[PDB]
């Protein structure tokens, strides 16, 4: 057969992307209420595992961090610690108003006004709390975001 | 032709371990009123491939290991021993026909605690080691009753040849004459492989970090393959030991079918048990052995030495 | 006996989807091969089905169009492709398509 | 030869698989990291004594292993007495620990 | 640049050191793991390295300072070091033993033909060019901000290098 | 439904069936259509080495019968 | 009125003692626990096939915000700032002025959707049904800036979702 | 002090209660000292309430014990109503008991199942959240929100029950006792579960009262105390139910008490469905409760009261009250001080989990490290209310 380098890189990129989105093992900070809706996303009706998303993942095997609740100033150092220990590729999902931008404690002295002040965020899931279905939509949006990555294709043209 | 026959044993073992992970997630799901993997490939048939490709391209963790040598030995020792345990199993013919197959398997499994011990010592974290030490004491503890129970069974078989266990059960399964021993055997294979309600390594991770905390995705994935290889092998051994299939030398493949179905059903009973009970506390799984299983295993060992003599049913030596 | 009848339904699903090619397309696109009444179709191509003998929550569903607003959605579909008129019916906020 | 060729393959396959896993992923340049991070190991007698108890019981098992071959002897009364004697000794060793504050790991 | 954009501020730094640098991280890794230093007559090279933050500060003040336009700058560290001693000092910090005495490839060449030619070039002294002093930045010593850089390489009481007047 | 777990168990079953099936078939192929000879004890080894000389081709699975008695 | 959850006295006849001995040695209750899990394996899973199937909602569901219009097409909002005053999270920012035709209309209407708690007090307080919480719950974004809605966005949401919003109001306005 | 193990649940697991940093001294397997550090979900809620009207402050109470949303609302509403000197109408009192018991079921499913999940018994968690998911639909149908309903308000409830809700609640309640029975078929007589809970974290009756415990933590030790029976507050004097009482004060009795409370909640829910009376849902007094949207668009007085209620808010007479209810976790109380304006001067929240967690060190003495997981679970700690 005959094939260019550009074609080979495009197909290998699709393979690794398909594997990375098909097997997303999430770490979940269950900081507050939004953790309860994260638990409903694992329960029978939605069953995130059927997408390949394991119920429980350790911090140092995790692929995505889900920040489900209010990030207080006392807790912020610990969350950045966990984020650094995560091996790459690593993605953060910000779930709910509190994590997205402080929410209903935005004007508090003890609350970080959004977790994007601490860690980079890939997807923002609105709600207080987002419904289990709304979080599931967010995770499926992360899978499509990963599908569009072009790591190998960029590397070839460097 | 023998090199081929080895790769007709090694490669199929790895694939079975690959697809035991799918079967585990789906069986647990349906016992939990959910579907489990069913999106990646039809009925989740590509979930193992996605997980495998995902881990090996994952960025490695930082080894930060006290002993580099013992860091790389632990996964090699664990993976190599798990594959080696399969060479004497009669299905219906062993790859290597040993006259002391049972002692070879018993002796080899005793070396499997070095992988736990080395990785813990090479981890470089003080709580990781205390995790490894707790696990080792559990593994060697339940080896004691496995050896004595295995000794009791072999006093009705009359040999250490694994193919002689088939002949012993030609008329009837050893599950009848030895159901008190089959109960304690089956549990000890749960505790030997560190499975629920004995998976104290995973359950108490926050309290005491497990020994495999330090390895990267690729190396950690290899520790996990060796662990389900042992779980499949210990249920294949459970089937040969207590549920012996009849062998028709003209139709060996009929043995391999009936034999394989019995191996799966016990292997899926491991999943069944995981989904049904809470975990043991460490002092409780030590109480279960040293104070319940061991007294009964010794009493039944005394019984199974006396019984063949007082019924004139001593098996042949050959 | 019932086992044979069960298998008959399984085969009926293969013909109910227009043959093996039709039955495999829904299997890989939707991960589900049930068949139900076509309640309607909408101007973008989505098709809507119900089967009232299913349990509450599965008795309605949509098979998303393969293209919408100039984007190839054979594989890439998302819950935001349901238009507002059907959004009410699909989420059971109403009882009338 | 066949046992040797079987073992050599099983540990050669394991060695290649581990060597590929450890090193080959290192060729991917995932950025570069910052800095990761007193106490000692407090020796516990309970974890030691369980290891020893296994050692002593495990040896008494080594004497029990020939029992399947030992029932082919003409002198069955002698064999039967010494078999029950050794298993009963394994029982007395257990009873001594049980009744003299020994199974402390069991608690 | 000086012809296309005459009002441009051209900044000339020396080897810059920092957490993610490829200068001290180069001496700690490439020299150590799998190799013994490839130093080519290390006694003949004099180096004047500058901290990253001082360069960052210098660049900002060139934006906010209106006299910087049209001027070329030279950002240099407080001290001049001997390339041999520098490598030695790096090793002491990283607790890697130092004993005086890798092909380019795809991916990302780590150690290359030209990189060596540069690590050996001697830091030119151009007094007429203004430096960090003229932008309100004090050059920071290597010693302070070298334990910061090299604490990662260190496995699991240190003496400084000797400056060249 | 529960029976959607079977395809996974079927693939796992096919995987655990190949080892036994291949070993039996390979034994027949290398040993002239009969089971591989089992020699646990020295007497069984003596007979196998006797058969090896008897055949004349140096294979212990080549049986010689009354036709050679002459 | 109270009851004793665990004040039984176990019977000490031999028949009962043997029952507990049989239970202890034969693992009876543990087998019973295995039976219940076995029964669930043959029960139908409660999972639904998201996104092809959706969870049931009601007309009162509180989702994404939108600004509505009258049938003629004029905006319902008169810039009374009752929603801004009530908002528990201070998520709403309003400015107003007289429009070119002298009408009382806003020039700035903003909702910081990352401040909002999706409580629906603003729709309860609006006198003209101008601000509503729609039925959309699938609008997660990739950047924080995409969740700070100005007037145009909320007007566009009203134009986008009016068909459904009006029907939901029709279904619930009598309860309100 | 053989070793100090600083155990941070920072890398949280599937519990969702929050995050707890636990500092312990382990003299071997045993625990000699336990020291919870609890600032991680402190959000300044009590100070923020001072800048909000009474209506604006109500949603804060949904987000305290975020598994007892409508019970926290009722406590706030009962406190405010007491200062206002008004009375909610009889229909709303029945709706508030009805959803108070649907909330108790919601809380105990989380309490028992996540307690069992931490001790390795994962399956009942999935069995019961299919039920909580059906209960979340009742919340969404009356309020529009699955969790933070904001539905129970001073004066009554925001809206009336939609037509067809009571039938669906009855259908849920009819099949629910069987769901509890399946749960007991996996835990009540299970020897492994009993070994993990029996004679763990024993609390004496005398130490319970002095340490401030309430709820199941008292009744497990044999104290006959329930606020619904001794200080009834809505229609709880008009419904028959029994209080489960423990005898040994251990985790296993506390586990049994909660499972029996779920049965008594279904008993109560049955009576509420049959006795639901007709009428209005909020106090018919428009200087406190907003008028109907039809009247506000027709009547001048209604528009004025609507305008002022949603801007200034109703003013509350000066005074201070301590109101407590039998929340699912325990006694939930608010000390609310009014300066006479429309914004509270001080709102102190009494969380039952605050005292229980402070009593952890007492209970953990002389237990192994793996027991502490069981002790925290049996307390039913959520850090939304521990910290506020
Ligand atoms: C190339 C071999 C190198 C060795 C690789 C490692 C060992 C061998 C493993 C091979 C992997 C085999 C599994 C491939 C999975 C195919 C994806 C799939 O399942 O389709 C469903 C998916 C489904 O799409 P989806 O993921 O968006 O589904 C969304 C969910 N639904 C549909 C329910 C709404 O189809 C795809 O999108 C294609 C993904 C890209 C596949 C790229 C891999 C194909 C092989 C290319 C090799 C190139 C080599 C150079 C020539
Ligand atoms: C042991 C077996 C286990 C089972 C199989 C394991 C899976 C095997 C199948 C997957 C192989 C995928 C290899 C790519 C690895 C992932 C690459 C990636 O993520 O991108 C990061 C990088 C992207 O490069 P980068 O430089 O842009 O990334 C770093 C970016 N900076 C600099 C900013 C930090 O990808 C690679 O490095 C690719 C390495 C080479 C891959 C092979 C290409 C050969 C084909 C092209 C040549 C054709 C000539 C004709
Ligand atoms: C190693 C085991 C791999 C065995 C499965 C085949 C994997 C390769 C699949 C592939 O390359 O095509 C994926 C393709 C990629 O699709 P595509 O990229 O060709 O997109 C074309 C879509 N149409 C034609 C509709 C416009 O997706 C699939 O069809 C899935 C095939 C895998 C199904 C295997 C299940 C049984 C095992
Ligand atoms: C590791 C396993 C090593 C070999 C184990 C052999 C065995 O136990 O089976 C006996 C087996 C089974 O014994 P058998 O008694 O059941 O049958 C033998 C065959 N008959 C009966 C016909 C006589 O014996 C053999 O097959 C002989 C194999 C040749 C001896 C090989 C010696 C070198 C082995 C390597 C030494 C260890 C390497 C370093 C290890 C590092 C530390 C662990
Ligand atoms: C009941 C199983 C049954 O139907 O009979 C077993 C049948 C006969 O057994 P056979 O291998 O021919 O030899 C018997 C004496 N040697 O052999 C077979 O039926 C073939 C194997 C299929 C039955 C598997 C039964 C395995 C039971 C143990 C697993 C338990 C699973 C959880 C319950
Ligand atoms: C007819 C038999 C009648 C029964 C014999 C007596 C049974 C034991 C009596 C007894 O005292 O039991 C109580 C006590 C149990 O101790 P324990 O509960 O563990 O204390 C800590 C609390 N958890 O018991 C003990 O503490 C000591 C019990 C030690 C028993 C160890 C025996 C191990 C060997 C098993 C028997 C094997 C056969 C022995 C040889 C018999 C030869 C005829
Ligand atoms: C005529 C003379 C002939 C000689 C014999 C005559 C007498 C025969 C009658 C005696 C029968 C002996 C029974 C042997 C089984 C072992 C008994 C046993 O050890 O059970 C007790 C053990 C702990 O007891 P515990 O509940 O903690 O009580 C308090 C402590 N005193 O409880 C436990 O074991 C707990 C185990 C927990 C893990 C269980 C998880 C799996 C359960 C389901 C598996 C079902 C069985 C699987 C069978 C597999 C067979 C292949
Ligand atoms: C898997 C299928 C499980 C069947 C459903 C559960 C079941 O039927 O078991 C209940 C039965 C009665 O147990 P129980 O309720 O405790 O009352 C007995 C009074 N002593 O419990 C039993 O009788 C089960 C006893 C099984 C026999 C012991 C197991 C021996 C294992 C080796 C074979
Ligand atoms: C290591 C193996 C890939 C090896 C191979 O197939 O060749 C992969 C395939 C599927 C994986 C497993 C499943 O995908 C997910 C399981 C769930 C928990 O996260 C524990 C790890 C978990 C048990 C995984 C362990 C390991 O990473 C697996 C087993
Ligand atoms: S966003 Fe809402 S539900 Fe989530 S933690 Fe904050 S207040 Fe609770
Ligand atoms: S829903 Fe509540 S928090 Fe959100 S904008 Fe409306 S009043 Fe403010
Ligand atoms: S949206 Fe309604 S309440 Fe808000 S300013 Fe406009 S008219 Fe007033």
Tab-separated table of C-alpha atoms in Angstrom, chain E residues 85-151:
chain	number	residue	atom	x	y	z
E	85	UNK	CA	33.331	25.574	38.814
E	86	UNK	CA	29.708	26.273	37.889
E	87	UNK	CA	29.146	22.656	36.890
E	88	UNK	CA	30.929	21.596	40.069
E	89	UNK	CA	28.755	23.866	42.196
E	90	UNK	CA	25.615	22.554	40.514
E	91	UNK	CA	26.599	19.001	41.413
E	92	UNK	CA	27.209	19.841	45.067
E	93	UNK	CA	23.711	21.306	45.313
E	94	UNK	CA	22.195	18.233	43.653
E	95	UNK	CA	24.286	15.935	45.892
E	96	UNK	CA	25.558	14.156	42.794
E	97	UNK	CA	29.279	13.280	42.835
E	98	UNK	CA	31.298	15.176	40.229
E	99	UNK	CA	34.123	13.476	38.321
E	100	UNK	CA	35.801	15.567	35.586
E	101	UNK	CA	35.447	13.432	32.464
E	102	UNK	CA	23.972	11.731	23.107
E	103	UNK	CA	23.078	11.919	19.424
E	104	UNK	CA	20.591	14.451	18.102
E	105	UNK	CA	17.410	12.725	16.976
E	106	UNK	CA	13.745	13.438	16.213
E	107	UNK	CA	11.315	14.286	19.019
E	108	UNK	CA	13.256	16.866	21.072
E	109	UNK	CA	17.075	16.776	20.862
E	110	UNK	CA	18.351	16.767	24.443
E	111	UNK	CA	22.024	17.700	24.169
E	112	UNK	CA	23.040	18.737	20.650
E	113	UNK	CA	25.998	19.742	18.519
E	114	UNK	CA	25.323	23.470	18.788
E	115	UNK	CA	24.247	23.515	22.443
E	116	UNK	CA	27.751	22.479	23.511
E	117	UNK	CA	29.264	25.151	21.271
E	118	UNK	CA	27.197	27.708	23.191
E	119	UNK	CA	27.713	26.478	26.745
E	120	UNK	CA	31.412	26.965	25.954
E	121	UNK	CA	31.182	30.408	24.352
E	122	UNK	CA	32.403	33.046	26.795
E	123	UNK	CA	29.958	35.651	28.079
E	124	UNK	CA	30.941	38.810	26.234
E	125	UNK	CA	31.361	41.975	28.277
E	126	UNK	CA	29.862	45.000	26.496
E	127	UNK	CA	30.094	47.827	29.042
E	128	UNK	CA	28.477	50.540	26.929
E	129	UNK	CA	25.199	48.608	26.740
E	130	UNK	CA	22.810	49.338	29.631
E	131	UNK	CA	21.817	46.480	31.896
E	132	UNK	CA	19.345	45.581	34.620
E	133	UNK	CA	20.695	48.481	36.677
E	134	UNK	CA	19.080	50.930	34.235
E	135	UNK	CA	15.600	49.372	34.539
E	136	UNK	CA	15.263	49.239	38.324
E	137	UNK	CA	16.112	45.540	38.693
E	138	UNK	CA	18.839	44.161	40.941
E	139	UNK	CA	20.443	41.049	39.479
E	140	UNK	CA	19.907	38.151	41.865
E	141	UNK	CA	22.719	35.827	43.010
E	142	UNK	CA	22.942	32.310	41.643
E	143	UNK	CA	23.443	30.885	45.125
E	144	UNK	CA	20.084	32.026	46.490
E	145	UNK	CA	18.033	30.787	43.540
E	146	UNK	CA	19.901	27.565	42.785
E	147	UNK	CA	18.679	25.402	45.657
E	148	UNK	CA	15.227	26.299	44.371
E	149	UNK	CA	16.063	25.059	40.879
E	150	UNK	CA	17.909	21.881	41.843
E	151	UNK	CA	16.001	20.550	44.864
